[PDB]
Amino acid sequence: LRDTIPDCALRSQTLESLDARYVSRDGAHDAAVWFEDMTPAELEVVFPTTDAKLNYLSRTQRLASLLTYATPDTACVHGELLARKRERFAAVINRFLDLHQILR
Amino acid sequence: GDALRVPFLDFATATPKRHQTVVPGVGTLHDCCEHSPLFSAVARRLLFNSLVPAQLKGRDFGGDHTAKLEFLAPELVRAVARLRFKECAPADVVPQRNAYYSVLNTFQALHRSEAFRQLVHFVRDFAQLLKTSFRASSLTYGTLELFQKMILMHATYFLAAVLLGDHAEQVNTFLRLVFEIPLFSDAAVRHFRQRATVFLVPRRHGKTWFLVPLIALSLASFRGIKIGYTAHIRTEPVFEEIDACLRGWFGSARVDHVKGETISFSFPDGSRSTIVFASSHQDFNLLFVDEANFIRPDAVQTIMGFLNQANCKIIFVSSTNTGKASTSFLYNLRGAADELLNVVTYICDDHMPRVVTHTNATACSCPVLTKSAGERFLLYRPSTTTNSGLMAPDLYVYVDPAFTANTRASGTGVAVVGRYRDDYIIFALEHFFLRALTGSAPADIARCVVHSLTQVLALHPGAFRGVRVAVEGNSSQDSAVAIATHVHTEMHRGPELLFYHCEPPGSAVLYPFFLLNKQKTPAFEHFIKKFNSGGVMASQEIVSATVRLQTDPVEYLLEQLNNLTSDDLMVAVIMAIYLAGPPHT
Amino acid sequence: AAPVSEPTVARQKLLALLGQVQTYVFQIELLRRCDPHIGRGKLPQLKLNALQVRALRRRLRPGLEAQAGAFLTPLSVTLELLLEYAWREGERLLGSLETFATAGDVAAFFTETMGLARPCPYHQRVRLDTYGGTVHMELCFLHDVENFLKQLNYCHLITPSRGATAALERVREFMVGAVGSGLIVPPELSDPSHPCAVCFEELCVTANQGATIASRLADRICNHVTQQAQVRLDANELRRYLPHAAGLSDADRARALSVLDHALAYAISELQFWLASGDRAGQTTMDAFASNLTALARRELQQETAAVAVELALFGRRAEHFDRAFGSHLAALDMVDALIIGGQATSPDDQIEALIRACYDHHPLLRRLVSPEQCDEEALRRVLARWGDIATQAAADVRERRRLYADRLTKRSLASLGRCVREQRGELEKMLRVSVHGEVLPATFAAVANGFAARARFCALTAGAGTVIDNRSAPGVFDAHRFMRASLLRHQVDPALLPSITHRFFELVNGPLFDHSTHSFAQPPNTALYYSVENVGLLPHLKEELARFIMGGADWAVSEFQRFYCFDGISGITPTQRAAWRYIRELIIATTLFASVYRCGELELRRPDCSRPTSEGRYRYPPGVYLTYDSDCPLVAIVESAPDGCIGPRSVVVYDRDVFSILYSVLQHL
Numbered sequence A: 001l002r003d004t005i006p007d008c009a010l011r012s013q014t015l016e017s018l019d020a021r022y023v024s025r026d027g028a029h030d031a032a033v034w035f036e037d038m039t040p041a042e043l044e045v046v047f048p049t050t051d052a053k054l055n056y057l058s059r060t061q062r063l064a065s066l067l068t069y070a071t072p073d074t075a076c077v078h079g080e081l082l083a084r085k086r087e088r089f090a091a092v093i094n095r096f097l098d099l100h101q102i103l104r
Numbered sequence B: 001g002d003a004l005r006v007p008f009l010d011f012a013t014a015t016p017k018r019h020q021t022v023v024p025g026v027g028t029l030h031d032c033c034e035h036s037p038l039f040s041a042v043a044r045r046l047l048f049n050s051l052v053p054a055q056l057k058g059r060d061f062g063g064d065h066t067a068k069l070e071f072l073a074p075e076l077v078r079a080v081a082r083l084r085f086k087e088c089a090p091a092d093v094v095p096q097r098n099a100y101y102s103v104l105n106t107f108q109a110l111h112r113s114e115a116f117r118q119l120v121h122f123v124r125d126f127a128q129l130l131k132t133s134f135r136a137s138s139l140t141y142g143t144l145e146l147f148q149k150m151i152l153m154h155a156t157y158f159l160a161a162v163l164l165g166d167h168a169e170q171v172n173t174f175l176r177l178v179f180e181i182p183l184f185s186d187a188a189v190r191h192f193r194q195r196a197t198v199f200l201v202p203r204r205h206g207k208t209w210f211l212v213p214l215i216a217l218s219l220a221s222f223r224g225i226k227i228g229y230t231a232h233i234r235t236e237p238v239f240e241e242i243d244a245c246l247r248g249w250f251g252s253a254r255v256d257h258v259k260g261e262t263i264s265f266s267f268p269d270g271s272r273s274t275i276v277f278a279s280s281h282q283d284f285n286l287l288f289v290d291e292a293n294f295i296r297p298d299a300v301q302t303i304m305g306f307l308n309q310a311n312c313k314i315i316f317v318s319s320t321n322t323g324k325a326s327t328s329f330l331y332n333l334r335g336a337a338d339e340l341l342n343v344v345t346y347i348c349d350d351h352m353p354r355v356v357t358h359t360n361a362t363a364c365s366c367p368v369l370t371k372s373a374g375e376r377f378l379l380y381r382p383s384t385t386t387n388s389g390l391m392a393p394d395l396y397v398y399v400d401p402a403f404t405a406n407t408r409a410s411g412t413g414v415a416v417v418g419r420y421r422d423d424y425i426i427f428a429l430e431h432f433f434l435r436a437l438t439g440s441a442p443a444d445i446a447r448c449v450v451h452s453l454t455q456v457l458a459l460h461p462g463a464f465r466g467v468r469v470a471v472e473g474n475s476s477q478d479s480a481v482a483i484a485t486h487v488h489t490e491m492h493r494g495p496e497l498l499f500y501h502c503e504p505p506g507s508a509v510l511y512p513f514f515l516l517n518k519q520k521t522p523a524f525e526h527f528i529k530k531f532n533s534g535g536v537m538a539s540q541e542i543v544s545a546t547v548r549l550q551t552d553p554v555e556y557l558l559e560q561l562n563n564l565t566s567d568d569l570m571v572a573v574i575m576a577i578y579l580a581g582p583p584h585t
Numbered sequence C: 001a002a003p004v005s006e007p008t009v010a011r012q013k014l015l016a017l018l019g020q021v022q023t024y025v026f027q028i029e030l031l032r033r034c035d036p037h038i039g040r041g042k043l044p045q046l047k048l049n050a051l052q053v054r055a056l057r058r059r060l061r062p063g064l065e066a067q068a069g070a071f072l073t074p075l076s077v078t079l080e081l082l083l084e085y086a087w088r089e090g091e092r093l094l095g096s097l098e099t100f101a102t103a104g105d106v107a108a109f110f111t112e113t114m115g116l117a118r119p120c121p122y123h124q125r126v127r128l129d130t131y132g133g134t135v136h137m138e139l140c141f142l143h144d145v146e147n148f149l150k151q152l153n154y155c156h157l158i159t160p161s162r163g164a165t166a167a168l169e170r171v172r173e174f175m176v177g178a179v180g181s182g183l184i185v186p187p188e189l190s191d192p193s194h195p196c197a198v199c200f201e202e203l204c205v206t207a208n209q210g211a212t213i214a215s216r217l218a219d220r221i222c223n224h225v226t227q228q229a230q231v232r233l234d235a236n237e238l239r240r241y242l243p244h245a246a247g248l249s250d251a252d253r254a255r256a257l258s259v260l261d262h263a264l265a266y267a268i269s270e271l272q273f274w275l276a277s278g279d280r281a282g283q284t285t286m287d288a289f290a291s292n293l294t295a296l297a298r299r300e301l302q303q304e305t306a307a308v309a310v311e312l313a314l315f316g317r318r319a320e321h322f323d324r325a326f327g328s329h330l331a332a333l334d335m336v337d338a339l340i341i342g343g344q345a346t347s348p349d350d351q352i353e354a355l356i357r358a359c360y361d362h363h364p365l366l367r368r369l370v371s372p373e374q375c376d377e378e379a380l381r382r383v384l385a386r387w388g389d390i391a392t393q394a395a396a397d398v399r400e401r402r403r404l405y406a407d408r409l410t411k412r413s414l415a416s417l418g419r420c421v422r423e424q425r426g427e428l429e430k431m432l433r434v435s436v437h438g439e440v441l442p443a444t445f446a447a448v449a450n451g452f453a454a455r456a457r458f459c460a461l462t463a464g465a466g467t468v469i470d471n472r473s474a475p476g477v478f479d480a481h482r483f484m485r486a487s488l489l490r491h492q493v494d495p496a497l498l499p500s501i502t503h504r505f506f507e508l509v510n511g512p513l514f515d516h517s518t519h520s521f522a523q524p525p526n527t528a529l530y531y532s533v534e535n536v537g538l539l540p541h542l543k544e545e546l547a548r549f550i551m552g553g554a555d556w557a558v559s560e561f562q563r564f565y566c567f568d569g570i571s572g573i574t575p576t577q578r579a580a581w582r583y584i585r586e587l588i589i590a591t592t593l594f595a596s597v598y599r600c601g602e603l604e605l606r607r608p609d610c611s612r613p614t615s616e617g618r619y620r621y622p623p624g625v626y627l628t629y630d631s632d633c634p635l636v637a638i639v640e641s642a643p644d645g646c647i648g649p650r651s652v653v654v655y656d657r658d659v660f661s662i663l664y665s666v667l668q669h670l
């Protein structure tokens, strides 16, 4: 039941070499389904909560999904959807403010 | 109950305790696994799939499991049984085991609640009695119609929240499963929890065939809960039928009743739930109002008073006929209400949308612009006189003339529109009717449009650099030209005035009229799309001289628009907007 | 009561493994935005996890392969998607971090990982390949995958098995890229205005005050294929968590808290361009929204400065994540483009509250808004109880029409006002809040693949096990087929049976997705088919030809001699379905007449889409004549299978293309 992290510990050895030498071998038993912890410490001091980490992960996703749609594909129907959604949300928030301005 | 009795599954992990959470059935997982409904809604259903009894999995569900939720191939189970985790942290094994077994003990304690045993004895007994189509079996199928399932959901989701309050989330999920409607937004399931809901079933569709089994099984399963009931003409058939079925599929020694009055079902204890009948005129919790279109006063007072209670759900299941479909007592309620009454109709709003709900009809018994867009349109109007910076500097005016008098289709339509942000806004409307036998119909029409424009100009001074005017010439080219000429001259008393011009076929002349033909379908198509998405609105200070002595101009326009499938104003509005090839000076 | 069935422990192990894989794919979606100088530090952990996923989807690869071919389940589908996407992203992130340290460029690494230069990998083709023509669409969004799956369930009675499996593989290959993240659902593929299959099922069921259901599917945000997850984030977040950080020396932690305490000591300008009606001078709602947004900007900038300072104190390096390495492209966006995306120190709920604390202030209408239940209650109570002159006249009429408009907005239309305000608030919340994912796509994918793989598995499983007496190869089967046809074309339909044909017809024209007739709260096949037919928008001139397709010596002998389930002549999607309906009605009426003339046995006219597997690999196909929807071997009659039920050594079956040949071979064998 020896774990994979205390099995191989050395220099780069590009991933396919490790796959060939350690786990693709048929003589192995394939125990040790223990994953590892990949999130760093410099990313926990500033986002110290799964909620805050998820919010940041969503903010950067919403930004990337704007930078890619801003060689001449020029239609990229996802881009037209993302422009229609923004131009709809703008009008909707403006009318939501204006209506309650009028209700007084 | 099988998935509740599972051992620890040691299952070591690397995430710090400051993040990990305890999902039931499984060990301790990172907090992200509680935010993703992809895994949460699976680890939550494979567990509640054990509380659901074996008589509520379906007709064909598998041997001894809900095979469409818990099925592992005979090769994947043998390849999974050889998977082994880190299995431990000796200083950290005991707390995780304690937490997991504590959550599972909470679940098991939920399994043993008497009030939950009653809800099970209700839903299981109902799905079992329904197998025989509610015959007199002591205890080809009896499929429920749609509303005959909505009534059951309305009763069960209420009595669940009333009898079992300390288990809101768990019983909510259990009922979502048992009705075979999982992945339902909690807004709908919450709507099921409301009281005082109204039904409207057509006769001979089945309302008493389903009520008396509902009444009988809401009596015999639950304990100590009364059940109201009221009708105008003295309920005797339903009462005798309830007596019959209860004495049939339960011990007749248990039922005790006096004719036309309280029926009571016995129990080992002194629970003795009752069906006291209020037809002949405390805590009821159902108050099944069986007829709600024929009530006499001094009998509505008990119903208005029971609304003051917090445990009664007055169900207004009342029949309709379609000869009196617009009941003087309920069909008006659909005006000012929100998720209160649900009609059971097969010929919907229009004269013949029946082909839509045709397949929905019982087998035994054998609008271009959306309303929301119209309500939003009239409901919200932007103030143009104070948001002039949002407007484009061009006005577009379309005149759709009719050159007759003393006719209902003799109205001239005029619209003055512009761009507002990237949307379109109406500044003025006219529905103008020639005085009979005037000598100057074009000038009368011109004076009407000029007066409208002027008012719009005065309300927004300095806003507009251009006004572009189209006079439809389909009716008469000469008469359209005459209108343009009078508009031209009168406006000569700043913004530049430009007319749309047309070079008629075979001609080299550019006339100041507009010919409506090939551009109609694109114009209408674009309008419908824009209007429906909230992109066309009316100015809060919209101008109209001709619609100022009987109805609101926007309300009037909307009545014409709702004929899309006298149209002068609709055409002018749609075409003015379409206009907003180059028109010129 | 001690031993629990081994499938239950295997399912618990699979749930734990799915949770671990989800955690790993969350760490991956984190390291795709972290500084490469830190990705190089976490390189060994990422390599170890990639090795783990590789060695993991080889112990489950034959298992999941056998599973896909036998009754897929939401757990298995979700696990396959997560394992495949985790493998993909692990290999890609490792490659992109090892490409770094050769270029040493951060902006390049971010344009690579976050996919800023990729050529839109969210396009796919299907090529449904039905009979009578092969219709091909293009999956782009998520609701498009949902629509295609519903379309396949609808036209399930024409498409063959292998074509359906090919289309379903090319759909799962797109779901791996879209539903693979399972946590953030990038906005390039989401259109909440499109209601999914469950919005219709929960709009048929909830209240409908008139308002034909086709008129309600236009306002719904559908809230199911992309949920909201309601993330909440405190104000002084890191200061709460810095004293108890992991692996920090007490001296460093103390001086870091000191630097934090010391350092603690949007596009608002573009609001005036918005259409703001009402009074211009004074306390208005647009100025209140501007002040709320300015306060939120102050909070976020303060948090960012504090974070930079504490990182300079603890590690000494101002880390460059995807919001600090692309701050040039950021901080230049408009008001709306900063509202949609933004707030790494706030939450979308904080933006919602900053807007609503500005709208709802100091006011009838708010009472209806806060509690609509009491509003409908009072409604029910009330129901039960019951040039110069031009300018001056313009000012006067605009005055008397603003007054009337405000009078309407305060007195009447309150139903419409409440509904519109609620819908606007919903359209705001669905746009701002973090969409995570939904549980509709794997559910429907499993529900459709189950039916199709079940048809294929029955076609392959009844191959042998006994006599396979075939009637598609015709020695003289004409002689015994025309006789039975003439013997059944003689009697009347006996309309006292139509309430059974009209049900056993919709029980076959239906699809495997919408059960709604085996729920144990079963609804008739009428509604069970109305769901699967109205969801996939059908022409109303076809919806009546479903209901009225049995009300009427022909019309139940429309098949030729050998070509019963054969659409060689016709082409299209509507006429192919019409011929399918003709053939199915013919089979049903033939079975009913055969029962009403001959008393040999029962047929019960079953379908292979039923017979879900038991605890392990057992199917027990009961006796009867099946439909099988296969143009190569449509009719399969199991005259007698076994004492247990499964197709065993004594399970003689009869293949045939010819319905009456089956009805004669059943009689001969029974």
Ligand SMILES: Nc1ncnc2c1ncn2[C@@H]1O[C@H](COP(=O)(O)OP(=O)(O)O)[C@@H](O)[C@H]1O
Pocket (backbone or CB within 6 Å): B142, B143, B144, B145, B201, B202, B203, B204, B205, B206, B207, B208, B209, B210, B319, B362, B364, B365
């Ligand atoms: N889906 C159904 N399930 C069971 N019975 C049904 C169904 N549809 C119609 N029926 C039949 O309709 C009748 C019910 O009529 P009933 O509810 O008494 O009419 P009313 O609404 O006028 O009181 C019964 O004969 C019942 O068998």
Ligand code: BEF
Pocket (backbone or CB within 6 Å): B203, B204
């Ligand atoms: F359909 Be009835 F109440 F005669």
Ligand SMILES: [Mg+2]
Pocket (backbone or CB within 6 Å): none
């Ligand atoms: Mg009757």
Ligand SMILES: [Zn+2]
Pocket (backbone or CB within 6 Å): A076, A077, A078, A079, C120, C122, C123
């Ligand atoms: Zn694209």
Ligand SMILES: [Zn+2]
Pocket (backbone or CB within 6 Å): C194, C195, C196, C197, C198, C199, C221, C222, C223, C224, C225
């Ligand atoms: Zn939806």
